Structure 1
Amino acid sequence: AARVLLVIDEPHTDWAKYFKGKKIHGEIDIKVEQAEFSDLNLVAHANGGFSVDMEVLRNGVKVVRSLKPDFVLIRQHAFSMARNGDYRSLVIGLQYAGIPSINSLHSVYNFCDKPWVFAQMVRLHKKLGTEEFPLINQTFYPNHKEMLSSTTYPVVVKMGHAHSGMGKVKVDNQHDFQDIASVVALTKTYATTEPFIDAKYDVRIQKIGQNYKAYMRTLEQIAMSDRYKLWVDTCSEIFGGLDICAVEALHGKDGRDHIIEVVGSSMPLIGDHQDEDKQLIVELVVNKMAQA
């Protein structure tokens, strides 16, 4: 009998290919079903029954086919303040259905608010100190109301729950801040400001299972340090543990490091070792599927 694995990722990565031939316990097979959040819906019952639905809008003359995932691999963000970018209810649905996931549905749900994720890093930074965990000094505003100034400009204003260079605005002076603050008013949501950094380079320390990779972009893969490993291990324990994650830090010309954030299972696969990470992810997923 087989095992269905739903991979929530943009069409771009042919997951069925990578899971080709992998057998759970060396004998059971894995049917790989893949779709984006937008093309999915579901009904979950507390007694156990459920049904996920595929293709709200896509090729195969739409139609919409339901399946029953035994496991889910979420490679896509669940929240985005941009129109239609609200799949949080789908995550809740999957959790309600009791479907095992990577990363855990719990973490995926708690990753829906960036400052909520950053708040975890704040706790770790509090415990560890700047010498161990140089977390940029960000400021969180529940809403633009007391959003009045910035101790040092330029400052980087990150609005709502954004990603992909979006929601980011670099402010250079007081008068320009007040305008962006008024724009934050119209967004009817929270924002954060952080000192802008004159960066010599930036790093991203990733961890997939027990695998660590450090890349430097200015994309040169550099070597891991106990310091780097501390950053990522620390962050990998949040929301009960993150199977796939990375910590982005900026190394300023001044030689000071500043950790800006931690990303979950949606972490974009970068570098030369593309397929390599995809294989690691496959091994991890197959193994968790075997433990169900």
Structure 2
Amino acid sequence: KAKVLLVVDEPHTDWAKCFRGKKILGDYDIKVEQAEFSELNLVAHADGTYAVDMQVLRNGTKVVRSFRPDFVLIRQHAFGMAENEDFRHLVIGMQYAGLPSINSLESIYNFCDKPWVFAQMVAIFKTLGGEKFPLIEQTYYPNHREMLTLPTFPVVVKIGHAHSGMGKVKVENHYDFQDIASVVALTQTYATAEPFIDAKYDIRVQKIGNNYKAYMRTSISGNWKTNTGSAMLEQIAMSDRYKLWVDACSEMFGGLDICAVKAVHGKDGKDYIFEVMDCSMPLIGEHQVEDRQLITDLVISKMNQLLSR
């Protein structure tokens, strides 16, 4: 018959299409349920039973369908400190129900705090050394009171856990740093400060299963936050230097099937790794369909090794 795959992602990608005609376990076909965290909810019981109910509006047709997934593919961020971005309660629920998934719910839960992820990168840094793993120097402030300890300017300050540029400020001098700290005191959260790199371009090394791919990204808007606004994106060739980067990061939290390393290439010719992203990394470049193909394969491969008749 068919197995139920829940894909948590936005409408602009048609995962039901991507898994069209594909088979698993020889005869079992694949039923895709797609929706975003904001549209999902569920209930789970210690005895193995659970039920997810999607709520979406398709063609003026407000849907309230219910179902029981046998596997999850997650493509969104489970946490964010802006309003209505908090979906940890759901990832917890899906682990409570024991759902198999990509990436593992374990890793997704742990990726809900950037500094916690960065701490894993710091450990890889201690293990590989700078030449091979050039981690940007960063300072972690559990809250605003420790920000009396001043970093070398200029720095980029990144407040809490947020996405697409949110909570990130370039800070050029001491007075302006005291001002930002006084604001961090109102967000009542943690913050980081790392050197502002004068950059030629962005670098993103990705890993989907066993497929590697490197991209570069130059701005055309005058903004240092090279995302949003607008920027010329082109693919570059994979080197082993790059491969070692995403390979080492992909081992954390028991293993990430899908992840990417973010780095800035400075005018001084040096790379600075500043973040690792997991299964919620957006697909980019002119090879997206390609990547979705790779992911599809991944989900099938994992469903076969983990599911039962």
Which of 270, 273, 283 is 1:269 aligned to?
283
Q: Tell me if the contact between 1:110 and 1:116 (Cα under 8 Å) persists in the aligned partners.
A: yes
CA contact (8 A) 1:149 1:174 kept: no
One-letter identity of the residue aligned with 1:275: V
Displacement of 1:63: 5.6
Post-superposition Cα deviations, 1:183-223, rounded to whole Å, max 9, x if no partner, equal: 10000110101000011122100000000000111122111
Q: CA separation in 2, counterparts of 1:210 and 1:118?
A: 23
Aligned to 1:122: 122
Query: What residue is the counterpart of 1:11 in the other structure?
Result: 11
Deviation at 1:152, TM superposition (A): 2.1
Which secondary structure state, in structure 1, belongs to the residue aligned with residue 73 of structure 2? strand
1:83 is paired with a residue of what secondary structure?
A: coil
Conserved 8 A contact 2:262-2:273: yes
Q: Which residue of 1 aligns with 2:254?
A: 240
Q: Are 1:229 and 2:228 counterparts? A: no
TM norm structure 2: 0.92
Q: Does 1:96 align with 2:110?
A: no
| Alpha carbons 1:5, 1:72 under 8 Å: kept | yes
Partner of 1:191: 191
Separation in 1, partners of 2:138, 2:53: 40
Query: How many residues get paired?
Result: 291
Match 1:278 to one of 292, 297, 303: 292
Identical counterparts, % of pairs: 76
DSSP-derived class of the 2:273 partner: strand
Contact 2:80/2:86, CA 8 A, preserved across alignment: yes
User: Deviation per CA, 1:213-253, whole angstroms, max 9, x where unpaired?
Assistant: 00111122111111111000000001000000000111101
- Check whether the contact 1:133–1:231 (CA below 8 A) recurs between aligned residues: yes
Deviation at 1:149, TM superposition (A): 5.0
CA distance in 1, matches of 2:150, 2:20: 53
Structure 1 segment 44-55 matched on structure 2, within 5 A? 44-55=44-55
Looking at structure 2, the residues matched to 66 and 266 of structure 1 have their Cα atoms a distance apart, in angstroms, of 24
Give the drift of 1:58. 3.2
Deviation at 1:26, TM superposition (A): 3.3
What SS class does the counterpart of residue 273 from structure 1 fall into? helix
Q: Does the 8 A contact of 1:203 with 1:248 survive in 2?
A: yes
Partner of 2:144: 144
Q: Structure 1: which amino acid aligns with 2:244?
A: L
Q: What is the TM-score when the length of structure 1 is the normalising length?
A: 0.97
- CA offset digits 1:46-73 (Å, max 9, x no partner): 1111111111x53465462211001000
Deviation at 1:9, TM superposition (A): 0.5
Q: Distance in 1 between matches of 2:36 and 2:248?
A: 30
What CA distance in whole angstroms lies between the structure 1 residues aligned with 2:96 and 2:61? 30
SS of residue matched to 2:43: strand
Determine the structure 2 residue equivalent to 1:212. Answer: 212
SS at match of 2:57: coil
Query: Which range moves more in the overlay, 280-289 or 145-154?
Result: 145-154
User: Secondary structure at the residue paired with 1:147?
Assistant: helix
Counterparts of 2:120 and 2:48 in 1: how far apart (Å)? 33
CA deviation profile, 1:5-61 (whole Å, cap 9, x unmatched): 000011111111111111113321001100000111111111111111111x53465
Q: Is the 8 A contact 1:9 1:75 kept in 2?
A: yes
Quote how far apart the aligned CAs of 1:182 are: 0.6
